[PDB]
Design a protein around this ligand. Structure first.
Ligand SMILES: O=C(O)c1ccc2c(=O)c3c(Cl)cccc3oc2c1
Ligand SMILES: O=C(O)c1ccc2c(=O)c3c(Cl)cccc3oc2c1
Ligand SMILES: [Ca+2]
Ligand SMILES: [Ca+2]
Lengths: 115, 115
């Protein structure tokens, strides 16, 4: 898959399992059109969101539902979600791994881009 | 002022100066209504965004223009912007500092909420 997302929990030191996320793509009218969605596995990873053919050039937004994750662990978090917004495939196809590290009042995100 | 934003640069080891950002408040129809905006100072801080009377409970989005910041420094960035989406909750007297640490392919954000 050309787009994979991995989510980790910085409180427990574990993968963040069953985290929902939605991916959007910016449309011509400047609105966010639905693109793909899923939930992380027991490894904290979400594979198979898209295919090479469907993953065209564009501006993409990954909205990770961190609030539901913390609520299900019984925790009141600060953020509604973690958002990652980036231009993809501007110079041809790439493989993107988006990672997010979660705490109740903080998150970090990094991208690993390979050819 | 109950809302301040501080931005740091992990590549140069410096405050992130002259970074533009917009704050939005979520409307009843799920759209994002402009709320406040500005640019960080020489200390990397943006003060005076709002007042106690204007900053009511709700969902807020801070959209930080990191792409323009990196391009002004001649450094190639990954993200279109950094986003911080959070709930303001009236639990006693509270001041909110939203902090962000920027790298070209990564960013980290935390909230410092004090009395
Ligand atoms: O792709 C992976 O397996 C992977 C492994 C480690 C990390 C990681 O430590 C990490 C940290 Cl500290 C801060 C922000 C994002 C991160 O994302 C990761 C992703
Ligand atoms: O508000 C301040 O003065 C302040 C000081 C230090 C930091 C800081 O190191 C920091 C780090 Cl590593 C990661 C993410 C956010 C951060 O926000 C900060 C904010
Ligand atoms: Ca292109
Ligand atoms: Ca309340």
């Amino acid at each position: 898959c050309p787009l994979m997302v991995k989510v980790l929990d910085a409180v427990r030191g574990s993968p963040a399992i069953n985290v929902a996320m939605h991916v959007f793509r910016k449309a011509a009218d400047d609105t966010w059109e639905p693109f793909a969605s899923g939930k992380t596995s027991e490894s904290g990873e979400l594979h198979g969101l898209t295919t090479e053919e469907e993953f065209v050039e564009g501006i993409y937004k990954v909205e990770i539902d961190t609030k539901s994750y913390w609520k299900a662990l019984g925790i009141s978090p600060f953020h509604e979600h973690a958002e990652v917004v980036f231009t993809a495939n501007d110079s041809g196809p790439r493989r993107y791994t988006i990672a997010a590290l979660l705490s109740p009042y903080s998150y970090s995100t990094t991208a690993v881009v390979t050819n």
